[PDB]
Amino acid sequence: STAGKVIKCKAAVLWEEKKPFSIEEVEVAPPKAHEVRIKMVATGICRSDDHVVSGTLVTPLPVIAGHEAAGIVESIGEGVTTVRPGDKVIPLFTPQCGKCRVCKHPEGNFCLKNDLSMPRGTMQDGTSRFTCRGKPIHHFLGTSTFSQYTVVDEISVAKIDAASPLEKVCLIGCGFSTGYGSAVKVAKVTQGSTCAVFGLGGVGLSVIMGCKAAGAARIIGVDINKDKFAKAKEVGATECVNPQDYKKPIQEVLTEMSNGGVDFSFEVIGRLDTMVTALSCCQEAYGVSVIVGVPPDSQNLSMNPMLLLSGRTWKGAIFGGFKSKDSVPKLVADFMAKKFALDPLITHVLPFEKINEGFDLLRSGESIRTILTF
Amino acid sequence: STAGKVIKCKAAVLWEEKKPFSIEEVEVAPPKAHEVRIKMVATGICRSDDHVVSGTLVTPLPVIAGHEAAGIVESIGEGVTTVRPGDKVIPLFTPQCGKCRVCKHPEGNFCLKNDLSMPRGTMQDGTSRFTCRGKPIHHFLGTSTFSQYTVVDEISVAKIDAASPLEKVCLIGCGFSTGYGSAVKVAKVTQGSTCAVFGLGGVGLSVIMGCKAAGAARIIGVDINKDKFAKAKEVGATECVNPQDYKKPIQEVLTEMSNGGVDFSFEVIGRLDTMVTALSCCQEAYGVSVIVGVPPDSQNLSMNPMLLLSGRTWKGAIFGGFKSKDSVPKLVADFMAKKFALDPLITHVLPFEKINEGFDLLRSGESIRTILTF
Numbered sequence: 124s125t126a127g128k129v130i131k132c133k134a135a136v137l138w139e140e141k142k143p144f145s146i147e148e149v150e151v152a153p154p155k156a157h158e159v160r161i162k163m164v165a166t167g168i169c170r171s172d173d174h175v176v177s178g179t180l181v182t183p184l185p186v187i188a189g190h191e192a193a194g195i196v197e198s199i200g201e202g203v204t205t206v207r208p209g210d211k212v213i214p215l216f217t218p219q220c221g222k223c224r225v226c227k228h229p230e231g232n233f234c235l236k237n238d239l240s241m242p243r244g245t246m247q248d249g250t251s252r253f254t255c256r257g258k259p260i261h262h263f264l265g266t267s268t269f270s271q272y273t274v275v276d277e278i279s280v281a282k283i284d285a286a287s288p289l290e291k292v293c294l295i296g297c298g299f300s301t302g303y304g305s306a307v308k309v310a311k312v313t314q315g316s317t318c319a320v321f322g323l324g325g326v327g328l329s330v331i332m333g334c335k336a337a338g339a340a341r342i343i344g345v346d347i348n349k350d351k352f353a354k355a356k357e358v359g360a361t362e363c364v365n366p367q368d369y370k371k372p373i374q375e376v377l378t379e380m381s382n383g384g385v386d387f388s389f390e391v392i393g394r395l396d397t398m399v400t401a402l403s404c405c406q407e408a409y410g411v412s413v414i415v416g417v418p419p420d421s422q423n424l425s426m427n428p429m430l431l432l433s434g435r436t437w438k439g440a441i442f443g444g445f446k447s448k449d450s451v452p453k454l455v456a457d458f459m460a461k462k463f464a465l466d467p468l469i470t471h472v473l474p475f476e477k478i479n480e481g482f483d484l485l486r487s488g489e490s491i492r493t494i495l496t497f
Numbered sequence: 498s499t500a501g502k503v504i505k506c507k508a509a510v511l512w513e514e515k516k517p518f519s520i521e522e523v524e525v526a527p528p529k530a531h532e533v534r535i536k537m538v539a540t541g542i543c544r545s546d547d548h549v550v551s552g553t554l555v556t557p558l559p560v561i562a563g564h565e566a567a568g569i570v571e572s573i574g575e576g577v578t579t580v581r582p583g584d585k586v587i588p589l590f591t592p593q594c595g596k597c598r599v600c601k602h603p604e605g606n607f608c609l610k611n612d613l614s615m616p617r618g619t620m621q622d623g624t625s626r627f628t629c630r631g632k633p634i635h636h637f638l639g640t641s642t643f644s645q646y647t648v649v650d651e652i653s654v655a656k657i658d659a660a661s662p663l664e665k666v667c668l669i670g671c672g673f674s675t676g677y678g679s680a681v682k683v684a685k686v687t688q689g690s691t692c693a694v695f696g697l698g699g700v701g702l703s704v705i706m707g708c709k710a711a712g713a714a715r716i717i718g719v720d721i722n723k724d725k726f727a728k729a730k731e732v733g734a735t736e737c738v739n740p741q742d743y744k745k746p747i748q749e750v751l752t753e754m755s756n757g758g759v760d761f762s763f764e765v766i767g768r769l770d771t772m773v774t775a776l777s778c779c780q781e782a783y784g785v786s787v788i789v790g791v792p793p794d795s796q797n798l799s800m801n802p803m804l805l806l807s808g809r810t811w812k813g814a815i816f817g818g819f820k821s822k823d824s825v826p827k828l829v830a831d832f833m834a835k836k837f838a839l840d841p842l843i844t845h846v847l848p849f850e851k852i853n854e855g856f857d858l859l860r861s862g863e864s865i866r867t868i869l870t871f
C-alpha cells in the first residue's frame with residue numbers, strides 16, 4: 124500500500140542542541156537500492172541519544188535521533204536479500220558490511236562503513252531520506268529510530284525471530300548488548316573474579332548481567348545515585364558503593380575492598396575522571412579495565428602511563444564488541460530461550476509522542492530504560 | 498675463602514644525578530638468611546640505568562645501579578635452597594616470591610615484593626649490604642650489578658645452566674627478555690600480522706625478534722636515528738621509517754603504510770608523545786599497542802579515549818610479562834638451543850672500569866648494548 128511511495132508520518136526532530144524534541148510531520152522517501160524502510164514498533168531512550176541533545180555527542184543537526192529499536196519492514200529497495208516486508212528487524216547503529224578489513228577480522232566489530240568516527244548523518248550514499256518543513260533532516264548513525272518510519276542501509280539492519288516481543292528486544296539494539304558484550308566479550312570476565320562497574324544505568328546493569336553470567340564472584344556497583352543500588356543488587360551486584368559517602372578517592376576504597384585491585388573494572392558513565400579512576404582501581408599487574416561510556420566530544424583525559432607499565436590492560440568497544448548483523452539475531456534467540464532478562468532494565472513505558480517526558484525521566488535519575496511505543 | 502666475611506671490591510657508585518659513575522672501593526656484607534652473594538661476571542648497560550643518572554627513573558641515591566647481568570654465586574645465607582656457591586646465576590630485577598596474589602596469577606609477573614613501585618633501594622629486609630666511604634649505599638631493584646660483588650634476595654635470583662656464556666646471557670636479565678616477551682607474551686603477536694616498533698635500541702630489536710619469531714608478516718622499525726635501521730633490518734625489520742623524513746605525523750604515515758593501521762604497535766623509547774602515537778597507529782577496531790618504554794617520573798600523558806572506544810587495546814608490561822624465576826632459566830636453555838640470537842644486540846665489549854665510556858656510547862647513539870666484563 125505504501126511501498127514505492129513517500130510516507131508522511133510523525134518523527135521527533137531535534138532542531139537545535141539543548142532543546143526538547145519537536146514531534147512533527149516528516150516525509151520519509153521510499154527505500155533506494157539496498158535500503159530497507161522500517162515501521163517502528165518500539166524504541167528505547169539511551170543516554171547516547173541525550174548526548175546528541177546535550178552536545179556531548181556531535182552529529183550534524185537538525186537530526187532524527189534514536190538508535191535502540193525494533194520494527195517491522197514496510198518495504199525493501201532493489202537488491203535487498205537479507206530481509207523481507209513483514210520481517211521483525213532491529214536497526215544496527217554499528218553496521219556489518221561483511222567485506223571490510225574489520226568485518227573480516229575475528230575480533231573486530233567497528234565496521235569501516237560506520238557513521239560514528241566522522242559523522243555525516245546520512246545514508247550510505249551521502250543523502251537523506253528525511254524531509255521536514257521542506258528541509259532535509261540528517262540521519263543518526265544510519266538508524267534514526269525516533270520516527271514512525273525510517274530508512275536504513277541493508278548493512279544496518281538485522282532480521283530477528285518472528286515471535287520476539289519488539290517492546291523488549293529493542294534493548295538488544297544498544298543497551299543490553301553493549302553492556303553484556305563488554306563484560307563477556309571484551310573484558311572476558313572470568314569465573315571467581317571481582318568486578319567493578321562504574322555507572323548503574325541501563326548499560327551498567329547489563330554489564331552487571333554479563334559479569335554474573337561469566338561467574339564473577341564479586342560485582343561492585345559504583346554510582347553517585349544511591350537509588351540505583353537496589354536494581355543493581357537485583358541483577359547481580361554483590362555490593363554497591365557511593366563515592367560521595369567516602370572521604371578518600373573511590374579507587375582507594377575499591378583497591379582496599381578488593382584487597383589490592385579488582386580483576387575487571389568498567390566505565391559506563393562517560394566521564395574522563397571515572398575512566399582514569401576505573402583503570403586505577405583494577406589490579407596493577409593483571410587488571411583489565413574497559414571504557415564503555417562516551418565522554419564529551421574532543422576532550423582529552425590525563426593519565427600516568429605507569430598505570431599501564433605495571434601490566435594493566437586498558438580497552439574500549441562499541442556495542443559490546445559484537446559483530447552486529449551476526450549477533451543481534453542470536454541475542455534475540457537467546458533472549459527467547461531465557462538465557463538473559465530484559466525486564467529489569469525497563470522501568471517505564473510511554474507512547475512515542477511523550478518522548479520529552481521519557482528524556483525528563485532519564486535526566487532526572489528516575490528511570491533506567493523508558494521504552495517508547497508507536 | 499671469602500664466605501662469611503665482608504668483601505672489599507670495586508663498584509660504580511652513583512652519588513648524584515647527572516654525574517659520571519664513580520669507580521670506588523666498597524664493602525659488601527656477607528649474605529644474611531635467604532640472601533645470595535654473587536661475584537659479577539658481566540653486565541649490560543640498559544637505558545633504564547641511564548634513566549637513574551638522568552633523573553628519568555627515580556630511586557634513592559647514592560646508589561649502585563645495574564640490573565642486566567650474570568655472575569657466579571660466591572656464597573649463600575642461611576636457608577637458601579635454590580642456588581649454590583659456584584652456580585651461574587642471573588639477578589632478577591623483578592622478583593618472583595611465588596606466594597603473592599600476582600605470583601599466583603596465571604598472567605601476572607609484577608611480584609608484590611618488587612622495589613619498582615615505591616623504591617626503597619634496599620634488600621627485602623629494609624637494609625643495605627653496601628658501604629662506601631663509611632656511608633650506606635642504596636641497592637637498585639634488588640640487583641645492583643655495577644659492582645664486582647653484589648648481594649640479592651633469594652627471590653631475586655635464578656640459577657641458570659652451568660655452561661652458558663655469561664657475557665651473552667646477561668642480556669636475558671633485562672633487554673632481550675623484555676623485548677621478546679613484549680611481542681610474544683604480552684602483545685601475543687599473530688602469524689601474518691603487521692607490527693610497528695618504535696625505538697630500535699636493544700629492547701626494540703628484541704621486540705623485533707619476537708615479532709619475527711611469532712610469524713609477523715611485516716615489521717616496520719621506527720626511529721629518528723637512521724643508523725639503527727641496518728641492524729633492525731638484520732634482525733627482522735621488513736621496512737624502517739624515520740619520522741624526521743616525513744611532513745605528516747608518523748601515525749598517519751604508518752596507518753597509510755598498513756592500509757588502515759597495524760595489528761600490533763610497541764613503544765620502546767620512553768616518551769609520552771610516542772606512547773600516544775604508537776596507540777593511534779594501531780588499527781582502531783582491533784589493534785593492540787604495548788608500552789615498553791619508561792617515561793619521565795610522575796608525568797601524565799594526554800589522550801582521547803575514543804582511541805580506545807573504537808576497539809583498541811592498550812597495555813604495558815615489565816620484563817616482557819615473564820614470571821622471572823621460572824622464565825630466565827628456560828630462556829637461557831632456549832638460547833643454548835639456538836632458539837634466539839643475542840649477538841646482534843651486542844655491539845661493544847668493555848672492561849667494567851670503562852663504565853662511563855659505555856654510557857657515553859649509549860648516549861651518543863653509537864651502541865645498542867655495551868657488555869661490561871669484570
Ligand SMILES: NC(=O)c1ccc[n+]([C@@H]2O[C@H](COP(=O)([O-])OP(=O)(O)OC[C@H]3O[C@@H](n4cnc5c(N)ncnc54)[C@H](O)[C@@H]3O)[C@@H](O)[C@H]2O)c1
Nearest residue numbers: 170171301322323324325326346347392393416417441442
Ligand atoms: N560504547 C558503546 O557502544 C555504548 C553503547 C551505549 C551507551 N554508551 C555510553 O554508556 C554510558 C552509559 O549509558 P546509559 O544509557 O546506561 O546511561 P545512564 O545515564 O542510564 O547511566 C549512567 C549512570 O552513571 C551514574 N553516574 C553519573 N555520574 C557519575 C559519577 N560521577 N560517578 C559515578 N556514577 C555516576 C548515573 O547516576 C547513572 O546511573 C553513556 O555515557 C552512553 O553514551 C556506550
Ligand SMILES: NC(=O)c1ccc[n+]([C@@H]2O[C@H](COP(=O)([O-])OP(=O)(O)OC[C@H]3O[C@@H](n4cnc5c(N)ncnc54)[C@H](O)[C@@H]3O)[C@@H](O)[C@H]2O)c1
Nearest residue numbers: 544545675696698699700720721722766767790791815816
Ligand atoms: N618495561 C620494561 O620492563 C623495560 C625493560 C628494559 C627497558 N625498558 C625501557 O625501554 C626503553 C628502550 O630501552 P633501550 O635500552 O632499548 O634504549 P635505547 O635508548 O637504546 O633505545 C631507544 C631508541 O629510541 C630511539 N628514539 C629516541 N627518541 C625517539 C623519537 N622521538 N622517536 C622515535 N625513536 C626515538 C633512539 O634513537 C634509540 O635507538 C627505555 O626507555 C628503557 O627504560 C623497559
Ligand SMILES: O=CNC1CCCCC1
Nearest residue numbers: 169171180190216297417
Ligand atoms: O548509543 C549507541 N552508541 C554510542 C556508541 C559510542 C558513541 C556514541 C554512540
Ligand SMILES: O=CNC1CCCCC1
Nearest residue numbers: 543545554564671791815
Ligand atoms: O630496566 C629494567 N627495568 C625497568 C622496568 C620499568 C621501570 C624501570 C626499570
Ligand SMILES: [Zn+2]
Nearest residue numbers: 220223226234
Ligand atoms: Zn565492514
Ligand SMILES: [Zn+2]
Nearest residue numbers: 169171297298
Ligand atoms: Zn545506545
Ligand SMILES: [Zn+2]
Nearest residue numbers: 543545671672
Ligand atoms: Zn633494563
Ligand SMILES: [Zn+2]
Nearest residue numbers: 594597600608
Ligand atoms: Zn610474588
